[PDB]
Design a protein around this ligand. Structure first.
Ligand SMILES: [Zn+2]
Length: 362
């Protein structure tokens, strides 16, 4: 018979079925909205959905009726200024644009104001969504401190869709990423070169650090690159394809994400942890153990355990480098209290030694 891990994987997959019709309504609405926004004359006319993946391995931890989508907007001629030395935050300035900067009126001094740009973004979405007549779509009351523009869809049960604006820049990647994406021994040098020729994204995010520059800071996003890696994750090109062999790489990611999700429900001490920490850890593990034969499906329980051990060691050393931005320590004392990491370590060790009873629930 199958062990608990395989049962949990089966159950996780079957959950996709309960979310499918809502997911379809979401795509319907988003696509209508994008068309309306693309028809209209505004600084957001060029907006498009950035595809980041929708399966459990790709998305953040969420309620079954909560969705997130990123709307990307190409912004030519950005001059980036590192705001944090780690590369955690940036200010957005501009180089010379002889024909005129189309985002000119979103500037505050030399810097692009996320506050001004999001305010207009919110206003336009609210106006267009009012024109959707066949399905009840409104905009949730703005949550001070949250940049998402949240759609509420009622058909007739309520679905929430957080819309996140992402600036698209086609310039070379920021200097803070120079040693990031360490995939040379795994996906290799040509893939790394190709991936780094793609755009990078900037998403509005406030730092929690005083009044100066609030509403003017952005963090980098590589959601596109991350999707690509998740779906092209083998040293062999045929990994998980029909004329290749399956590996257990995504299964380990899913198990570890679900472990954290279930733990986060039980213990609000774990509020500062998110699925991105898990995805980051596993990117590092995929780099350390690049061979597809080091992720054989036969070895699921051993591979999951070596991922736990790795994550536990990141917790113990208080260090988990962003995979794209090596100086950005996601497990710094300032982002996550030492006592929270010690608490999570203790919970993980407990689960690992008792056959994962937290997976026994619904
Ligand atoms: Zn594979």
């Amino acid at each position: 018979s199958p062990d608990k891990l395989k049962k949990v994987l089966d159950k996780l997959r079957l959950k996709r079925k309960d979310i499918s019709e809502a997911a379809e309504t979401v795509n319907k609405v988003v696509e209508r909205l994008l068309r309306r926004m693309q028809k209209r004359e505004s600084e957001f006319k060029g907006v498009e959905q950035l595809n980041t993946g929708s399966y459990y391995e790709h998305v953040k931890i969420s309620a079954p009726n909560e969705f997130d989508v990123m709307f990307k907007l190409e912004v030519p001629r950005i001059e980036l200024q590192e705001y944090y030395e780690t590369g955690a935050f940036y200010l957005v300035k501009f180089k010379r644009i002889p024909r005129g900067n189309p985002l000119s009126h979103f500037l505050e001094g030399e810097v692009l104001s996320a506050t001004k740009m999001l305010s207009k973004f919110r206003k336009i979405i609210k106006e267009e969504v009012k024109e959707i007549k066949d399905i009840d779509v409104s905009v949730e009351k703005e949550k001070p401190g949250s940049p998402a523009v949240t759609l509420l869809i009622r058909n007739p049960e309520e679905i929430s869709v957080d819309i996140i604006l992402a600036l698209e820049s086609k310039g070379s990647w920021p200097i803070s990423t120079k040693e990031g994406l360490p995939i040379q021994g795994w996906l290799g040098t040509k893939v790394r070169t190709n991936l780094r020729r793609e755009p990078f994204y900037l998403v509005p995010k406030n730092a929690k650090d005083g009044n100066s520059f609030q509403g003017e800071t952005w963090r980098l996003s590589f959601s596109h690159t991350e999707k690509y890696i998740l779906n092209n994750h083998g040293i062999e090109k045929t990994c998980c394809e029909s004329s290749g062999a399956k590996c257990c790489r995504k299964e380990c990611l899913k198990l570890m994400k679900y472990l954290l999700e279930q733990l986060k429900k039980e213990f609000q001490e774990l509020d500062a942890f998110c699925s991105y920490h898990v995805k980051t850890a596993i990117f590092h593990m995929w780099t350390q153990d690049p061979q597809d034969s080091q992720w054989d499906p036969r070895n699921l329980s051993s591979c999951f355990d070596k991922l736990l051990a790795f994550f536990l060691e990141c917790l113990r050393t208080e260090k988990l480098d962003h995979y794209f931005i090596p100086k950005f320590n996601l497990f710094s004392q300032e982002l996550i209290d030492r006592k929270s990491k010690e608490f999570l370590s203790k919970k993980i060790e407990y689960e690992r030694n008792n056959g994962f009873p937290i997976f026994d629930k619904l």
